[PDB]
Every structure is written in C-alpha cells, then in structure tokens.
Amino acid sequence: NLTPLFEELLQQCPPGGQNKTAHMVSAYQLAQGNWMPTSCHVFMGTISARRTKTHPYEAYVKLRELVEEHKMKTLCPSSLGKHNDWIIGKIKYQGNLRTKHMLNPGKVAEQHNVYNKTIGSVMTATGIRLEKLPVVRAQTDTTNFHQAIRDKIDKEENLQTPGLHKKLMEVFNALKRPELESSYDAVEWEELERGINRKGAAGFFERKNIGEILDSEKNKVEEIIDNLKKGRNIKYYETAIPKNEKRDVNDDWEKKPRVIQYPEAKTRLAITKVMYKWVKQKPVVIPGYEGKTPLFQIFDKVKKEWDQFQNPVAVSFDTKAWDTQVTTKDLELIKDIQKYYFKKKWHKFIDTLTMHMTEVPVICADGEVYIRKGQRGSGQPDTSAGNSMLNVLTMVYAFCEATGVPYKSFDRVAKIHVCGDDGFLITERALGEKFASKGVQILAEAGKPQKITEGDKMKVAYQFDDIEFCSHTPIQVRWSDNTSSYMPGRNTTTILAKMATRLDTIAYEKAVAFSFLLMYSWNPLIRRICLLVLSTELQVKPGKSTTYYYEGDPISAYKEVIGHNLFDLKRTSFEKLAKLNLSMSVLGAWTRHTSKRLLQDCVNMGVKEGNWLVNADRLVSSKTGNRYIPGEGHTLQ
C-alpha cells in the first residue's frame, strides 16, 4: 500500500554501492513488512534490511530517521584552493548573499522588453490582443537575482553512486571513435574568427568584447593559452548576470538558467582556440548530438528512426536545473574524454582548465563574490558539448541499468537524441516503459534528478508527434505533390509573443519574419503575419542579427532549405494544430474575427496588380487569382 511513500523517500536517500553482505530490499518489500532497514544508502532503489517482526509503517519511520540523521551530518561542512586566493585580495566590503553552502567572501568594488513596431502593428491590425500574450524575455532585479542564486546555485555537490563515473566511462568506450584518438589540435586565429560573435560579452573585470580583444590583445589570449598548456594557474573567474541582461550575449550562433555564469572574453577565446574541435563538435563525436541540426530539419530526421521500430515510444530526458547538478566527478569524466581525443601536448592544458572549473570564483554584476563548487556555468565554451556528452553517457547508463540491456547493445535497441541537457530516446515500447518507471530512481542516484511526472514515471510519447525537443513538437503538413513532412511545432501564443518583442528597425523585423517563416509556415496565422511583414518596404534588405536571413527573394530562400515552395503547402495536421492553438482561445489573444481579418488583409493586398509575397500563401492566392513569381534567393545564417 505505502509503496509510493517509500519510493518518494528512496529518492531522498544518499546514493550508495552494491551490498552483497546484506539483504537489499526494494520499496515493495519494505511496504510488505517483515523487513527492517539497516542503512539508508540506496543502490538501484534498494536498501539494506534485516528480517524481523516489523510492521510497514514502523519501517518507514526507520528509513526516514536514517535519511534525516545522515542529512543532519552533512549539510554545512571548505578550504579555498590556493589558485583562487587572488580574488580575496579584491574584496572591499563584506558579503550579503547569505549563502549557506558556498563561500560568500565579500563584495568587490563596483564597475528593456520593447515591441517590434511593424510586426506588432500587423498583429494589432488583425485584432490580436498583444497585452494578453504571455510575457517572454523577462528581466529580474538584483533582489530576485540574488534569491535565484540562493535557490539554485547555493548547494552542495550531488552525491552520486560510488563507481558511477567508472561505469559512465565504460559506456563511453562503447561509443568512442578510435580513429580520432589523440588527434585534435588547436586551430588558427583565422578559423576561430570565422565562427564567433564579436559582440561576445566582457567579464566583470574586462572592458573589451570578443571582437575588440581579437583586434588588439591577441597576445593576452595567447599568454593564457601558454600558462594553461604548461600547467600554470590563471586568474579564472566567471561573471554572474541575470538572464536577459545586457551581457547575456551568445558567443556562437529560453532554456538558459535564471543565472548566466560566464568566463572572461579573453578566457573564452583561449579555451575555444585550443578546444575548438571538441567544443564546436567538428566533427560530431557525441552520439545523437543535434546541436548543428536546423530546427526545420530535426523532426524529419527523427521520424525515419521512429518508422523502423515495431511499436516505438519516446522517453523524455527532463533533468531539473541540469547545470546545477553537474559534479566535480562529472567534469573530470568529461576531462578524461577530452584527453582521449586531444593530442598529448594539450593534456596538461585540459587538466588545469578542468581544475579551475571544479571550484570557481563567481562575481555578480553588483560585485558580490561566491565560490561555486563544481556545477556548469551557462557561458562556458564547453556547455553544449560537455553537457551533451554527459547527458548521453548518463542516459545510456540509466536505460541499460533499468532494462538489463548491456552498454555495448544500446545502439541495437534504441536511438538517442540530445541538445545539451535536453533530449529523448526512441526504443520499443516494453523497453521504454521499463526505463521510464525505473529511470527516475536510477537517475536520482546518478545525481541528475528528474522533473517527475504523475506516478513518478518519466514522460513517454506513444505517438510520434507527442515528442518534445528544443521546446518544440512535431506537426505534420501535406504538400501538393502528395507527400507529407514534419515541421517544428509550438503553441501559437508563445510564437506570437517571441515574434512581437525584443530586448533593446525594419531590416531587423524582416529578418525575424523570414526566420519565423522557416520554422512556422505550418501555422496559417504566423505564416500570414510573416508574409505581410516581408511585404513591407521591399527596397530595404533584411538584417543579419537573427538566426537566419535571405539574400534576394525570401520565398525562393524558403524553398532552398525547406524542399518545397510555400505555395505547395496545402494542409496542416488538423488535430495537432488544434492543440497548439488552444491557449490562443484560453488567453483570449484572438477573437472569432482574427483569422478572417488576417486572410482578408492578405487578399486585399494580393488582388491588386503586381507581384505580392502574400500570394505565396496557397489560400490567399486562391482568393486573389494572382500568384507570386519569385526571383532568386538563398538562406544564410
């Protein structure tokens, strides 16, 4: 009966190893009674117990007792490493973070959401009620910023199963790429400068952004590389800022933590110049890594896998606050894998870098300092590559331990896909259901707790378009050549909000409209707003600040990456569209007039003489009698 109470308690339990010297009992056995727990250290959901005359509820209080006594004896222990001493010398005032689990040695000296006016007014012309759209890209004040630190970052490292990382290395060995062993070398400045945002933010003590350092202090970046190569400490620190702050800028081309934590600009450059081939995944060596896959391609790619199983399911990876769950032992596991691929001349570089990373001085925007114990910093060059690999290994381990499949046999029964901590695997229904039910506890013990579903089971998708990945979900479309394909779907209310606002001109907006058209042409509402915005001021070229932009004609650019003409899209999946439109009605962001007013405005523009983008919309052109004849055009990043 009280099996669920025990299963709840068993994920508070400290992870332990296998105990052959005693009886290991599960939550079922404890609930049955006549089992007396001798230790709260959990191993694969089992506890050491003693046969006795014990009623169930009494056994629960013993375990709960144990779990609390152990928690009392390990909640507030640490020395500062010598290489981090320098930060103490910059402290000027006493600290007020009030951290409980990490040192707040003090404070060093000190050092908006607006509308896209064209996109926004097209929406309003339609009767879309902007003030009813969800809030996106919200900023946070210093007070809630420091609370987020206290809430998420201020913690002890997760305890993990003894010998866990040995086993995760055994998984790695089952998927390494031996032809690449000990081959990675640094890259040239020219190759680095090709894929780099020159606006990459400066760190707390820095003044110049990435571009300015490139142009004028390349020797400072090389002094850092030289120090690390030789095993010598650098002054490593990360800067904390709240999400959507001015320095919340991406180095490379929503899921971010509330607390961005990033290395200096000179330092991000030192790491990338040496560790390029791994942090950029050139080539891809992490199985199922979708970091380079365009969002308009991913679900088509995944469906071909889905179609080869007999009764496929997909099991979602959903780790609570992943970056705060990364342990020193996790980072060293990634260090060891990096050393596998890199030439030996860079091993001491990787050792020293990783060492700096296990205890990181972090400086808040306002100057407060905390010493972070392990964990991942949002802004590190190795976030995507390091988190993806750690996610893959951990999930393959967990699936294999839950199902009994051997690590070397994973590739035979499942497909995995990851984008950092985000991912899922496809496998046969029986395997997937076993993993979903037993994964929660195994991954708790591995130090990667899940956001657990009703019933404490992992989320399982029994039909393809129930998969969740990168905040999107498959939705099918029907083309006029009698084929079907899949596009990245997402709630209309969310798409509208994202398209309608930015953080602090026409050329930008048309870059956005194009970008959104590439992802959301399955959504008639979004598609028609896009075409109206692209119809604005045809003489101004699109900006290049966003995900994509077009050279020449946007409609032809679309056809180049999507594989059909916009005008060939004849149907969007009726059921799924209804799901993704639901919130529009719940929130009252549209009315009964909104689709017809938007279509009418498109028709009014397209009936007139000339060559109008809006006539690339199959239904708009059907009502106007005119088509769009498109020029040349190409999509660019």
Residue numbers in the entry: 13 to 89, 91 to 124, 132 to 273, 281 to 531, 538 to 670
The publication says:
Compared to the RdRPs of other Flaviviridae representatives such as the NS5 of the Japanese encephalitis virus (JEV) and dengue virus (DENV) in the Flavivirus genus and the NS5B of the hepatitis C virus (HCV) of the Hepacivirus genus, the pestivirus NS5B contains a unique ∼90-residue N-terminal domain (NTD) that does not have notable sequence homology to any other viral or host proteins. The global conformation of our CSFV NS5B structures is consistent with the recently reported CSFV structure with an RMSD value of 0.9 Å (95% coverage) between the reported structure and our representative C-682 structure. These structures together reveal that the NTD adopts a globular α/β fold with an α-β-α-β-β-α pattern. Collectively, these biochemical data indicated that the RNA synthesis fidelity of CSFV NS5B is fine-tuned by its NTD through the intra-molecular interactions with the RdRP palm.
To better understand the nature of the NTD–RdRP intra-molecular interface interactions and whether they regulate the RdRP fidelity, we designed point mutations at the Y471 and E472 sites in the context of the WT NS5B and the N- and C-terminal deletion mutants. The NTD–RdRP intra-molecular interactions are fully disrupted, and the NTD is rather involved in a non-intensive three-way interaction involving two symmetry-related neighboring NS5B molecules in the crystal lattice. These structural data together suggest that the selection of Y471-E472 mutation sites is valid in perturbing the NTD–RdRP interface, but the interface may not necessarily be fully disrupted by some of the mutations. 60-min and 180-min were chosen as representative time points for a comparison also including single-point alanine mutants (Y471A, E472A, and the N-91 form mutants). Consistent with the observation in the time course experiments, every mutant either lacking the NTD or bearing mutation(s) at residues Y471 and E472 showed much higher level of misincorporation than the WT did. The effect of E472A mutation was highly consistent with AA mutation (compare lanes 4/8/14/18 to 5/9/15/19), while the effect of Y471A mutation was slightly smaller than that of the E472A and AA mutations (compare lanes 3/7/13/17 to 4/8/14/18 and 5/9/15/19). Although NTD–RdRP disengagement, a situation mimicked by the crystallographic open conformation state in a crystal lattice or the N-91 construct in solution, results in fidelity reduction, engaged NTD–RdRP with perturbation from point mutations can achieve similar level of fidelity reduction.
